[PDB]
Structure 1
Amino acid sequence: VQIVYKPVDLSKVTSKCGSLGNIHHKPGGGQVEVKSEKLDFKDRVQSKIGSLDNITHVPGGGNKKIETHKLTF
């Protein structure tokens, strides 16, 4: 068995941006309610229960390059 694995990555990921300018995120307030009696969690549970998510994600360049190489035998 002879294997060779020479992936040649080169990829430029360019993004210039001379300006972004003013931004405004001014919503109003809102309510949340959840009601139950009991529960039970098992084996890799993930659960957000009740939230108010206000975000302002502003990268001056936010290029997400991602990769996943993987071999197996």
Structure 2
Amino acid sequence: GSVQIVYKPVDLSKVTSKCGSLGNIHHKPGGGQVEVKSEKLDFKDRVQSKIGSLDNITHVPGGGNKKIETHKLTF
């Protein structure tokens, strides 16, 4: 007798992340007038301030991919 082993696994797979703003159409978006009048203010602690008419903001901490393969043949 004899032993024949053929190990031909095939991987054709796709792992894909599509995360954020993709393929959107923005036709003539208009931000209105913005007026910020401030008088006699006191701030004791940290201030973060954002003022504007039209904002497109995309934040993507996600969309990571992890692929693990193990192949083991023992004789």
Q: Distance in 2 between matches of 1:3 and 1:40?
A: 79
From 32, 42, 67, the equivalent of 1:30 is 32
Task: State the percentage of identical aligned residues.
Answer: 100
- The root-mean-square deviation of aligned C-alpha atoms, in Å, is 13.0
Between stretches 30-39 and 4-13, larger displacement belongs to: 30-39
1:32/1:51 contact within 8 Å kept: yes
Larger % of strand: which?
2
Instruction: Give ranges in structure 1 of 5+ residues lacking alignment.
Output: none
CA, structure 1 residues 13+2, in 2 after alignment: closer, same or farther (shift >3 Å)? same
Instruction: Give ranges in structure 2 of 5+ residues lacking alignment.
Output: none
TM-score by length of 1: 0.41
Aligned-residue offset at 1:13: 0.2
Aligned-residue offset at 1:8: 0.6
1:32-69 residue CA offsets vs partner (Å, 9 max, x unmatched): 99999999999999999999999999755311000111
Runs of 4+ in 1 over 6 A off after TM superposition: 20-58
TM-score by length of 2: 0.40
Larger Rg: 2
